Amino acid sequence: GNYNYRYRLFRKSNLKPFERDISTEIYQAGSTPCNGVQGFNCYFPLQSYG
Amino acid sequence: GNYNYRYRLFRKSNLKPFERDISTEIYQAGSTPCNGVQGFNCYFPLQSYG
């Protein structure tokens, strides 16, 4: 496995053309806040390719 | 996608029978002490099914 290449899997809105997103904030996919901790309905935005 | 189901992808050694590992420690896959922060050669142990 080469997990050094990552792609952003979760975002609130689509990107404008020629825009980059280097943020690492936890994507809240539920009603409960995440507080920067992964868990139930709180996911890391970047996933490795493998 | 249903990303609430996770599996442990990286571990130092294989598990014993009837043993569980709920620890969330950043697995170092290189020679760099990266202080528990994901990035190059430091991966999260848990990966989502999706």
From Swiss-Prot, chains A, B:
It comes from the Viruses. Changing residue 7 to F: In strain: B.1.1.298. Changing residue 40 to V: In strain: Omicron/BA.4, Omicron/BA.5, Omicron/BQ.1.1. Changing residue 14 to K: In strain: Omicron/BA.2.75, Omicron/BQ.1.1, Omicron/XBB.1.5, Omicron/EG.5.1. Changing residue 44 to S: In strain: Lambda/C.37, Omicron/BQ.1.1, Omicron/XBB.1.5, Omicron/EG.5.1. Disulfide bonds join 34-42. Residues 2-10 are annotated as: Immunodominant HLA epitope recognized by the CD8+. Residues 1-50 are annotated as: Receptor-binding motif. Residues 9-44 are annotated as: Disordered. Changing residue 29 to V: Increased resistance to neutralizing antibodies. Binds to host ACE2. RBD also interacts with the N-linked glycan on 'Asn-90' of ACE2. Cleavage of S generates a polybasic C-terminal sequence on S1 that binds to host Neuropilin-1 (NRP1) and Neuropilin-2 (NRP2) receptors. Interacts with host integrin alpha-5/beta-1 (ITGA5:ITGB1) and with ACE2 in complex with integrin alpha-5/beta-1 (ITGA5:ITGB1). May interact via cytoplasmic c-terminus with M protein. May interact (via N-terminus) with host bilirubin and biliverdin, thereby preventing antibody binding to the SARS-CoV-2 spike NTD via an allosteric mechanism. Attaches the virion to the cell membrane by interacting with host receptor, initiating the infection. The major receptor is host ACE2. When S2/S2' has been cleaved, binding to the receptor triggers direct fusion at the cell membrane. When S2/S2' has not been cleaved, binding to the receptor results in internalization of the virus by endocytosis using host TFRC and GRM2 and leading to fusion of the virion membrane with the host endosomal membrane. Alternatively, may use NRP1/NRP2 and integrin as entry receptors. This is Spike protein S1. It comes from Severe acute respiratory syndrome coronavirus 2. The chain holds residues 447 to 496 of 1273 of the full protein.
